[PDB]
Structures are given as C-alpha cells and as structure tokens.
Fold this sequence. Notes:
It is classed as transcription,transferase/dna/antibiotic. This is part of a larger assembly, with 1 copy of chain A, 2 copies of chain B, 1 copy of chain D and 1 copy of chain E. By secondary structure, chain A is an alpha+beta fold.
Amino acid sequence: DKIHARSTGPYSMITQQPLGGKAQFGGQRFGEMECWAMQAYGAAYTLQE
Amino acid sequence: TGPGNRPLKSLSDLLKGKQGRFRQNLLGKRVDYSGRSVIVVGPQLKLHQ
Amino acid sequence: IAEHPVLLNRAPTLHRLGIQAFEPMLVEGKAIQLHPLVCEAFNADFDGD
Amino acid sequence: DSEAVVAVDAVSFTLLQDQLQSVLDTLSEREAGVVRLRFGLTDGQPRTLDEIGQVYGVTRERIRQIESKTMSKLRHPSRSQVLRDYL
Amino acid sequence: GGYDTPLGITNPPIDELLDRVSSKYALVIYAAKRARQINDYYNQLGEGILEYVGPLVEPGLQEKPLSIALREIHADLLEHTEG
DNA sequence: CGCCCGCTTCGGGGCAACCCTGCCAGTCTAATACAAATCCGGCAATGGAGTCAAGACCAGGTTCG
Ligand SMILES: [Mg+2]
C-alpha cells in the first residue's frame, strides 16, 4: 500500500501539473524546501528540469 | 456564502495565503518520473550505492 | 539502469544534505535499501519512514 | 483531464507516419502517388478518382483499377507484418 | 594516490578530475557539453559526417556518453575556455 | 470665554510546516393565450462519385509446325 512510481500519467485540469496520490497515478511533491536545497547546492540545471 | 454556508472563492483568494498560486503551484509542483516507498537498512552496499 | 544516478529525497528536508544522489542497483522486494551511514544526514530511522 | 495528450500515442503516431512512409515508398511512384492522393496524406482533403485522373492525365477507371490492384498488393504479409501492431 | 581501485559511478576519481578545472561547476558544464557533442555524433553517424568528433578514448560495451566524457576529461584530451 | 494637542485605548489585518489520505452539499397559487422560432419526417430535384461489364490494344515471355 506504499510503493509507488510514475513515468507519465494523468494531469490536473486548471493548471497542468501531474496529479497526486497512489489512488490516481500521481507524482511526488517537489516543494519549497527541496527547491531551497537544490539552490543551496548550486545545482541549477536540475531545478530547471 | 454559497450552498452549505461556505464562503465563495473570489479572485483574490486564488493568490492569498497558502492555497494561492504562489506557495502552492508556482514554487513547488508535482513532478513526473518519481516514486515513493519505505526504507530499510542495507549494510552490504558501498557508500555511493 | 547501470551508471545512472538517482536522487533520494526525505521529507521534511531540513537542510542542504536532505537530497543526495546515489547509484541504484536492482534489489528484490519492495523496500528502498539505504546505506547505514547517510541516516544521520537524512535524519531517518527505520520506524516506517 | 482526459482531453490532454497521452504522450506515448503521439510519438507512436509519429513513428507510424514514418513507417507508413517507408511502406508506401517501397512501391513505385504512380502507386504511392495515387494512394496518397486518394487517402489525403500530403494534404487534408482526399482527392477523388476524377481528381486523380485529372492530375494523372487518364480516366477514373484506370485510377480505380490501379487502386484495386494496389490494395490487393498491400495486404501481403511482407507489407503487413510491420504494420499489424499499429492498430 | 594510494586509493583502492574505484568502481561504478566514481571510476574517475573526483580529486583527480578537479585538478584540470577551476571549480566543480566548470567541470559540470565541461562534461555535459562534451556529452551533448558525443550524443550528437552518434545520432548523425548514419548520415553524412559533420564537424562533430567521436569518442576519442575507446568506449565500453554499452557505455553512457557522459562516462565517455568524464574519462576523456580525466585523460586530459580536451581543452576549454570560460566565459 | 470654548478650542485644541499629547497620551491612552480599541480594533482591524496577517500568520501560525512539512511528506500520504482523500472522490458529489437544497425547495412552493398556477395557470391560459398566442406567436414566433426551430426542428423533424418524408419524398423530390438531382448529380456526382463510384462500380461493373466489356473491350480496344502494345508488346514482351512462352510454347508449337
Ligand atoms: Mg522515523
């Protein structure tokens, strides 16, 4: 009930982000603090990706 | 208020607070090519594995 | 899979060492095996995280 | 959002167009030109038998016989074993 | 230079790589642009040959282009200028 | 003489974390009259698009006297 993965599934309606949760296919959330970590590395191209 | 005594979502409420466009969909988005599972200890691996 | 790094997140990401990149290898079962030395940087014990 | 792009069938459509180009180009020029004008591949509107007979300087009956012979040709397994998995 | 024989991702040693460049960001863009050149060589191989130059060192069996880029860097076979 | 400036008090707005997990909320005069608009059901002008039968015929492999 926990293992999950996604290559390309559905997408949201108003905005066009991928969906959420294992009930749908859904992708993980790359929130604010992880963007702060990727900025703090100096790694910028992965953030653009 | 609409039905069920819930206040309607006006135009400024698409931006304000935590549920706005800024702190929810602009800075941190759901991504594709992702996964999630539980972890266990792997003491036979090398450090970079 | 061989020679293709992946990023391993742990939520919440407190600081810069909350995202590190490993080399994967195929492991039976359904649990993400982890090295027992990056647990201090990740701040992750194995109580179901 | 079901009206979005499934993003594997689009690239499969592109590879299908290239495979159909290879299969149609394995034949001659008159056959492939008549087929593409008949089913509307180079343009949106499919040209009719009278239109292809006009552009080929013939009657429509020769165009129809060419169409029947080419459709009898294309159902060969040598020209079908690559296109069978595309439906 | 008395380490054990490395393996996998870290087969070119990073401290032997970082004596060729100034800092690690330059090394990142160095290896990435070399890898883009190598993959553009492989894809335009079936057509006529262009100015893109192939893998200088001998490749593996089925190696990623980025590892070929890193080994070409470590073998001191390229040259680069910053911006 | 009532008029007006320093203090005090009162109130309004903002924020208060981060990973999964989630799947649909209510009600009371009621009719006629008519007219315009839209549709739909069914032949009737085709007429063009395709189908078929036959044949005229150009000329290179294929088999006899
Ligand atoms: Mg824990």
